[PDB]
Amino acid sequence: ATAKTIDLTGKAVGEVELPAVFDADYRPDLIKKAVLAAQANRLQPYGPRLYSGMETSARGWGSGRGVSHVPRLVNSSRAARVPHAKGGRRAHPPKPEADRSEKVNTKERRYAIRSAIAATTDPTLVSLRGHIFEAELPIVAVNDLESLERTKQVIEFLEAAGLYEDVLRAKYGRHIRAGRGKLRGRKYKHKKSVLIVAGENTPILKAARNLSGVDVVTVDSLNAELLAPGTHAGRLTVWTESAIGKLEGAFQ
């Protein structure tokens, strides 16, 4: 229902009434649907070229030569163009014309977002999600958190709130992943630590941006995948007063 607000030193200096977005029941299935839909809508078309393995004039020898009936080069016995021939076409490859986007109705996507927002208040979900923290949820901060412009100020606030341990966990838990992703550009497997939600575009977006594992966004740019990374709800999040005020009819 009601939540205390902590100043930059971390002491409660008032009360805020939580909007109706916070007493929404926990729906991991709908959260999973919303996050999977957003991930799928992010995806990018790919596939082999149009005639890859097929730009030959190869034809079969037929019967009477003691060889398989596969197409062969017109001036050699080397087989061509068939999916079981070396250099032949891929049978059933990925198609750039394939449509990977998923649809989720706006009503159930908003329901999933509300469920994920309410999941930021449960200590059991947040600690089970992986986060290390010593604060009391939900964490509402006075609006002056939005006006601070350097990373050191954010560090001081997070330490005063007992949230910086999660940032350190994300920083030291950053690990070089296994496999081909490193060559493709995904060298690290990153952790998620803290979500800061601001009332509007403020200096705290840049100020908290470089913290390890940290996401800083506004209420307008809040979606299911920020509140449930990997389809798991229970993200440790810092709300500001303006964000809580602006969340009154945000997804209802």
């Binding site: 490193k182 060559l183 493709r184 550009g185 060298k187």
Partner: protein, 119 residues
């Protein structure tokens, strides 16, 4: 120079591999000593043939010597005293990466060097 335009390893390495010679000059950068960084205002400078450096990584940590030679294509420097004795027994220089050394004394026989280091 390789901007955050491309965070892809392939594009970074292609840029470095096919770098022009004037870009490979900047690859010879090395950390300045505390006195040099204080009295130049910059944190690093290009290792030039002649200036004194201290090797701070590898088999030759702690050695101080003058840069004998610089190769821009290889991106290596050669330092007096950093050598590889070969099966003959004759002493051959072992090329070093400039990022493994630290400049302690700059060669300033070139009047253009000061602006080359900064601005």
């Amino acid at each position: 120079m390789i901007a955050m335009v491309s965070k892809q390893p392939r594009k970074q390495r292609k840029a470095r591999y096919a770098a022009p010679l004037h870009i490979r000059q900047k690859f010879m950068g090395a950390r300045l000593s505390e006195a040099l960084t204080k009295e130049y205002g910059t944190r690093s400078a290009a290792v030039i043939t002649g200036d004194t450096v201290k090797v701070m990584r590898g088999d030759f940590k702690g050695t101080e010597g003058k840069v004998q030679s610089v190769s821009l294509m290889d991106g290596t420097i050669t330092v007096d005293g950093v050598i590889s004795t070969k099966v003959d027994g004759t002493e051959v220089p072992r090329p070093l990466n400039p990022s493994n050394v630290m400049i302690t004394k700059l060669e300033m026989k070139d009047g253009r060097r000061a602006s080359s280091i900064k601005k």
